[PDB]
Design a protein around this motif. Structure first.
Motif, PDB file in Angstrom:
ATOM      1  N   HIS A  67       5.238  47.152 -11.291  1.00 59.18           N
ATOM      2  CA  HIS A  67       3.791  47.155 -11.114  1.00 59.18           C
ATOM      3  C   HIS A  67       3.015  47.165 -12.426  1.00 59.18           C
ATOM      4  O   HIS A  67       1.787  47.159 -12.423  1.00 59.18           O
ATOM      5  N   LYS A 126      -0.832  38.264  -4.219  1.00 57.34           N
ATOM      6  CA  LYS A 126      -0.089  38.946  -3.164  1.00 57.34           C
ATOM      7  C   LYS A 126       0.397  37.998  -2.070  1.00 57.34           C
ATOM      8  O   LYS A 126       1.535  38.102  -1.609  1.00 57.34           O
ATOM      9  N   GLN A 134       0.824  37.235  -9.626  1.00 62.37           N
ATOM     10  CA  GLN A 134      -0.093  38.336  -9.346  1.00 62.37           C
ATOM     11  C   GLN A 134      -0.851  38.130  -8.037  1.00 62.37           C
ATOM     12  O   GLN A 134      -1.672  38.962  -7.650  1.00 62.37           O
ATOM     13  N   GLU A 193      10.078  45.649  -7.144  1.00 57.91           N
ATOM     14  CA  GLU A 193       8.779  45.204  -7.628  1.00 57.91           C
ATOM     15  C   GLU A 193       8.299  46.112  -8.751  1.00 57.91           C
ATOM     16  O   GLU A 193       8.275  47.336  -8.621  1.00 57.91           O
ATOM     17  N   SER A 244       8.236  51.085 -10.946  1.00 58.89           N
ATOM     18  CA  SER A 244       8.845  50.110 -10.047  1.00 58.89           C
ATOM     19  C   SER A 244       9.104  50.674  -8.654  1.00 58.89           C
ATOM     20  O   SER A 244       9.366  51.865  -8.495  1.00 58.89           O
TER      21      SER A 244
END
Lengths: 534, 545
Positions: free
Chosen positions: A522, B469, B467, A520, A162
């Motif tokens: 990933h 961007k 997903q 975020e 993250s």
């Protein structure tokens, strides 16, 4: 970002800055500027016409302006709110650039202008305008820019898989900035610091500083501040307060002024809590009853010069000004004699026409009247004696002579209440009662802003520092209690002196951001169960 | 020669407390089992503590185990107004010495407490949080151990390092900032749902040289007293933190009536925070200084799904966020926005996984996903929302919906679909295991994002699953003030100290971001000292000649 303090110029004869200031002063002689309210890029006039007068020559109307009404203020709120999202979305560096450019303008081509407008409009002498409208304002803009840019580097820990990032959002809503007459720089900071952090602002400048305030505003706009980020809205005090605290969109009040007014605003916000979309942030700098405490080991010359400056510069019209002086009996003959001799050499007059002037008229008719009431009290009280000065004359300007009073009562009202005039009260204490007297310094007033101890004995200085820890938020050893410099002595105090957000230091801007943290991740998330449950 | 000498400041290396696995046969699992057994059938009599004195009043109260309310886990009492005022007086008399202690010395107390919680006291605080607040193993672990330990260590680091933040000195003077505690006392008022929050609310101001009256949550008393005892054992002096459970209104009336109040550190309901704020305003003329109010007040948090989302991540992350600890988190997801295109897949998966969720006794069955809600009041409120769901034509219960309070305050996880994005259940915080779903047409995702932002009064947490961007960037901009803790492809709960400082604005509070480096700044009132080393000159200036 690397920044240093703006140099304080010497203004020697034949110097570039002195020639420039003389021209700028001549530029204002006989002039009245018509200063409108500014909403976005619109110059707006109401019928509520007001005038700013030159304190040392009140026949000179230096500006005509007007009070924004409830409707205009509400319009200014709506327009500002519509501009806020895009401004807040700008990179911090880009907003910072506006203030760095404004700083360079104030440093160079506009220095003479803002100094002159501060001198003529607010009655400051050359050096008082220089340390204020130039150096302090310039430093606020450069240092806050540095602090803000560097704040974006304050980021949390990221652990794979993250990434964490803090976004220093401006506050959602509008900020009301309410500035005082006595420093041009304070207005620039109260409106400017929140704007820098992505806020939009209704700025109600002081009536009696309108000329210089509008000069700063125009410089900011010229430096690239977009429309509707700062609205320039002179207004009746209560009307402005009633209006901004009635708006569901208020998110902050940045205030410098009287304790009662700050308390009133605080109570209005509290009364209206259920209307606001978020909890407004109130910041208040509210003045002081500041001390110089002298120990028998003090350097007398420093005590005398530092106290004269602290008590009388700009007519004592500083939240940091010394108004109570504590002297040990053993030094009183020296200090009394020296104060009275130096007093007779102080020149009070027109600061534009006579650079020999130490200080000039006080700000307006109301201040003149308040100060006269205190002089009259000093002529009445059985515990007070006027040692020098005490004269006043408002026929041409609001002129009050510096006044030195001795009190036999360390708890007299004059020892407690903020006068905001050139009025110094002295209490003489027995040498053997210095500890008891230090306690009195701490316990006598409701304030906690500035204070100085003069002493050349280390143990005494250490003891006094500990004892006065909460008597002064800006504490001075062997220096005067006024003249805090941005980045060197962040300014503010507690007790009744305000919220102590320390403008001039690195943390002040934190009041004007409401951070968001973004995480975020990933990699896809696993099951909702945990292995220990198996 | 300098009369004031300022010592060099040190630095502190700390890292997040590792989360334990509690696998079968592991030492931590055996220790936890033992600590749980240590509490079975036990009632602790928890006094008020003022200084070192254990005090009892007549206002006897009980804390019940949420999943077995026949078990009174603690007997405690409410401090009366006299005792609260005595606690204030004693704290004030202790304050100057404590404030004058070096920051590093105060920090040592919290670092010691952190180590005790990490090691020898871990099982104890976990078990007391499980039994007293109804947490499962992992919910207790991330809270009473990890988060509380992290608050203590990271705040100690931030505080010690803060003394290194010093102003510029230029000849002939030396400038130094003293990070003073606030002059007066701080009232700390903590909520039932995190043991760690109580420790931070009282502990952070104490670290910064303040003295504190701590009113812990009635329904978290057992674990809270355990934390308090650990702080004292770690070396916290008497009268720095007074342990004073009390009636809420009574406590608020008393502290806001003291001229010496300098702060309230609050976590709880919006209305109570507003009430305290108004009481302070009412008493403004009595205070020696302007009190500082800090409040964290809850949320109505969202998970927003874009068509490009990873379905499995949406399902697992949403189930955890909505239902862990019975949804009793200010950060819990209570509204899920799903595009029509993914609704068949997501609905199917949610319903399947839902049927597998085990609700039960977290002490006796480690297979339990979550347990009973905290008390009778919470149970009653949730029951009324479940009933509203049945009555409302706009709402349909997709899964769960039952509840039973005969043994514990047990509520099934409940998934509801609303056809109305503005339905009251989409706006009001329930603090229960109740997820509401709204399905939106894919081509209206932008309009729907606006609804996510505008629908509630809150701004605490939220997540976007996507997903794409471009979409993530767009949503991130649009939702900037809808969430103070914003998540991309992760669940909306479980902020970690030092990684996701926690808090949000709008109605959600003052957003002082406990867990970050700036939180401590609310609890210090700095003083700047300038020492000048040369005699001053004349009062005149050269330009006046």
């Amino acid at each position: 970002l690397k920044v240093a303090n703006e140099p304080i110029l010497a203004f020697s004869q034949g110097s570039p800055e002195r020639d420039a200031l003389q021209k700028a002063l001549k530029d204002l002689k006989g002039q009245t500027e018509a200063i409108p309210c500014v909403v976005g890029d619109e110059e707006v006039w109401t019928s509520d016409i007001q005038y700013q007068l030159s304190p040392f020559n009140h026949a000179h109307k230096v500006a005509k302006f007007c009070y924004a009404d409830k409707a205009l203020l509400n319009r200014a709120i709506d327009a500002a709110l519509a501009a806020r999202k895009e401004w807040d979305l700008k990179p911090m560096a880009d907003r910072a650039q506006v203030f760095l450019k404004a700083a360079d303008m104030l440093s160079g081509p506009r220095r003479a202008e803002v100094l002159a407008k501060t001198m003529v409009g607010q009655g400051k002498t050359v050096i008082q305008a220089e340390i204020d409208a130039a150096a302090e304002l310039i430093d606020f803009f450069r240092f806050n820019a540095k602090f803000a840019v560097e704040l974006e580097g304050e980021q949390p820990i990221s652990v794979p898989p993250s990434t964490n990032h803090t976004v220093y959002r401006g506050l959602e809503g509008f900020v009301a900035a309410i500035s005082p007459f006595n420093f041009t720089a304070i207005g620039g900071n109260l409106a400017g610091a929140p704007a820098l952090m992505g806020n939009v602002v209704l700025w109600k400048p002081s009536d009696t500083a309108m000329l210089a305030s509008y000069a700063v505003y125009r410089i900011l706009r010229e430096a690239g501040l977009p429309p509707n980020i700062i609205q320039f809205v002179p207004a009746d005090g209560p009307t402005f307060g009633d209006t901004v605290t009635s708006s569901e969109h208020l998110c902050g009040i940045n205030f410098t002024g009287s304790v009662p007014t700050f308390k009133h605003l605080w109570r209005q916000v509290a009364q209206n809590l259920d209307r606001f979309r978020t909890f407004p942030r109130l910041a208040g700098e509210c003045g002081g009853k500041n001390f110089h405490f002298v120990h028998s080991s003090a350097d007398v010359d420093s005590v005398v010069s530092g106290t004269l400056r602290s008590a009388f510069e700009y007519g004592g019209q500083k939240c940091s000004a010394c108004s109570r002086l504590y002297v040990p009996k053993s030094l009183w003959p020296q200090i009394k004699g020296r104060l009275l001799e130096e007093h007779s050499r102080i020149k009070v007059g027109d600061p534009a026409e006579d650079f020999g002037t130490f200080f000039s008229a006080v700000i307006d008719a109301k201040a003149f009247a308040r100060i006269k009431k205190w002089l009259e009290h000093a002529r009445s009280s059985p515990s007070l004696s006027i040692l020098a000065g005490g004269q006043c004359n408002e026929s041409v300007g609001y002129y009050v002579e510096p006044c030195i009073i001795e009190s036999k009562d360390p708890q007299e009202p004059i020892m407690k209440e903020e006068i905001f005039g050139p009025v110094l009260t002295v209490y003489v204490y027995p040498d053997d009662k210095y500890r008891e007297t230090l306690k009195l310094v701490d316990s006598t007033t409701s304030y906690g802003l500035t204070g100085a101890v003069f002493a050349q004995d280390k143990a005494i200085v250490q003891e006094a520092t500990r004892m006065l820890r909460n008597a002064a938020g800006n504490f001075y050893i062997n220096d005067k209690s006024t003249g805090s410099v941005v980045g060197q002595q962040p300014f503010g105090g507690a007790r009744a002196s305000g919220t102590n957000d320390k403008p001039g230091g690195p943390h002040y801007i934190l009041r004007w951001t409401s951070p968001q943290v973004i995480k975020e991740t990933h990699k896809p998330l696993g099951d909702w169960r945990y292995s220990y449950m198996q």
